[PDB]
C-alpha cells in the first residue's frame, strides 16, 4: 500500500497527456474504443453523466 501511494505520486497525468500514453500503459483503452467502433455506436455509457452532453438543447 505504501508502494501504491508512491506509484500514484510518481505518475498522475491530471493536467493533460496524450491518449496514446494511456493506451501504452493500458491497451484496454484502445480496445474499448475499438469495441465501440465495432459495435455500431459512438455512445460511451456513463460518459454523459460526468462529462458534457455538449448539445444545443
Amino acid at each position: 500500500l505504501q508502494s501504491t501511494l508512491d506509484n500514484i505520486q510518481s505518475a498522475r497525468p491530471f493536467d493533460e497527456l496524450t491518449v496514446d500514453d494511456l493506451t501504452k500503459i493500458k491497451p484496454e483503452i484502445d480496445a474499448k474504443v475499438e469495441e465501440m467502433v465495432k459495435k455500431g455506436k459512438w455512445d460511451v455509457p456513463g460518459y454523459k453523466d460526468r462529462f458534457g452532453n455538449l448539445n444545443v438543447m
Binding site: 497525468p13 497527456l17 496524450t18 494511456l22 459495435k39 459512438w42 455512445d43 455538449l54 448539445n55
Partner: protein
Amino acid sequence: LTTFSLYTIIVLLVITSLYTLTNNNNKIIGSRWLISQEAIYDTIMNMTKGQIGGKNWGLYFPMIFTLFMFIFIANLISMIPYSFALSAHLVFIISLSIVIWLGNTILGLYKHGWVFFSLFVPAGTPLPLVPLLVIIETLSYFARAISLGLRLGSNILAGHLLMVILAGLTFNFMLINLFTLVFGFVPLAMILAIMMLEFAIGIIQGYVWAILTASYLKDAVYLH
C-alpha cells in the same frame, strides 16, 4: 487548372487542420478549439440517436457527420469575398441528394421486400381511397430526393449572389451625387448584417441537411 478542383483541395486542407492544429497534443482535457469538435460530435450523436435511434444510429453516423462538416466548412469558403463554394456548383449538391435518396430507396426495398410498399400505405382508412393514399405517398417519397438538395443549393448560392449585388450597388452609390458619397458606410453595414446572416443560415443548413436526411432515414429503416 480547374477552380472547382482547386476548391476541393482547399476543403480537404481545412478539415485536416481541425484534427491536427486544433487537436493539439491529443489532450485528455481537450484543446480550446477542439471543444467545438467535441460538441459537434455529441449534438449529432444525440441527434441521430434521437432521429433513427437504432443500433444503426452510430452505423450511419459517419455519413451524417461528413454531410454536416462539408456544409459547415463550405459556408466558411462562401464567406471568403473571392472564393466561391463547391456547393454553389449546384450540380454536385443536388446530385449528392438524389444519390443518398436512391441509397435509401434501395436499402428499404432490399430490407423490407415488396412490403416496402406498406411504407406508402399510411394508415387504415376506407378501402376505395386506399390506392390514392399509396400514390401520394410514393410521390412525396420521391419528393425527398430533390427537396433536400434544392434547399441547400438555393440558400448558399442566393446568399453569395445577394452579397455581390449589394456590394456592386454600394460601389455605384459613391458614383452617384455627393449626398450619397456621404453615408457610404451605412449600406456597407447592411452588407455586414447580411454576411452575418449568410454565415448563420449556412450553419443552420448543415444541421437542417443532416436532420432531414435523418428523417428520411427514419422512414426508410423503420417503415414509418
